[PDB]
Each structure stands twice: as C-alpha cells, then as structure tokens.
Amino acid sequence: MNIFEMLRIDEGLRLKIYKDTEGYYTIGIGHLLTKSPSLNAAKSELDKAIGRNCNGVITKDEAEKLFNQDVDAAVRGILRNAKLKPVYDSLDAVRRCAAINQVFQMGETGVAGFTNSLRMLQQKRWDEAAVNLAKSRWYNQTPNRAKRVITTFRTGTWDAYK
Numbered sequence: 001m002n003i004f005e006m007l008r009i010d011e012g013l014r015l016k017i018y019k020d021t022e023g024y025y026t027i028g029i030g031h032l033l034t035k036s037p038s039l040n041a042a043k044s045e046l047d048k049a050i051g052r053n054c055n056g057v058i059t060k061d062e063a064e065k066l067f068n069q070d071v072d073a074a075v076r077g078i079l080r081n082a083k084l085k086p087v088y089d090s091l092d093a094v095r096r097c098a099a100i101n102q103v104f105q106m107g108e109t110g111v112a113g114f115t116n117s118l119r120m121l122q123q124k125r126w127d128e129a130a131v132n133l134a135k136s137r138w139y140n141q142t143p144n145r146a147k148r149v150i151t152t153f154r155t156g157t158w159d160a161y162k
C-alpha cells in the first residue's frame, strides 16, 4: 500500500463526468472540476485541465495524469501551510498518507476547524486524536471512508485498507 493505491480505493475511477459525494462535477480519480452547478462550466474546466476538447470523457492515462498532479498538489499544499507542515513533518510515513488523503478530500481550508485534532496528532495521542477526528461533518457525511482514514491515523498501519 501507498498513497496512490489508498486514494484509488477511496475515490474510485470513472472516465466520464460524474458528481462527487457533495454533488460537485468530478472526473477520473476524484479530480474535482468545479463547484458550479453548470455542466458546461465543468466541461470547460475539464478541457482546460486536459488540453483538448474532451466532451466530458477522458482516458485512463489522462485520469492517472490528473491524479499524479492532484496528489503532488495536496502534499505541496500541506508543506506551504504553517499550521499543517509541523504536524505532517512530525508523522511517520503511513500516517502522512492519512493526512494527504484527508487534504485531497477536504482541501486545506477544509481542515481549518481541526486545530484540536492537529495538536493531538503532534502529541502522538493516537486514540484521543481518533476520537476527536470523528466529531466532524467529515465523519458524519462520509463515515466509511473517514473510519478508514482515522484507523490509519490511530494505528500507523494499513489495516483499514487490506
């Protein structure tokens, strides 16, 4: 297991524009296109991202290219965030994947309310952090996935991903 295999499990792979769990136009391996309810706006974003007129459909290679970019961008983001970086750097490699996964799903601004969980993670108070992480809209709206990510933070193992 690694971050790519982990996010591939959590996000799936679809080659036509679909709506994600929040109802937003998405393609590939969880590549968010736009939060606009206009499908035409989503198609413009897709064409811009791929570099050709896609008409709402991409190839597996194209999906994987967006995925590489999106993972890279999640990490590089974390490292530019003065609140996230020290906690990320304090973690082992497996728990770092949990962090990348959550930021990929939620965005950086998405995790602004996680101040208390962040502190517990840096302190390596793993069971306490896991309890705090679940007190969230995130957990309530996507519990199966959140449970996996939280187990990864709690244990530093891949047990939730078999």
Ligand SMILES: O[C@H](CCCl)c1ccccc1
Pocket: 078, 084, 085, 087, 088, 098, 099, 100, 102, 103, 111, 114, 115, 117, 118, 121
């Ligand atoms: O997945 C968590 C969310 C904030 Cl507790 C995370 C922890 C450490 C760095 C970046 C994200």
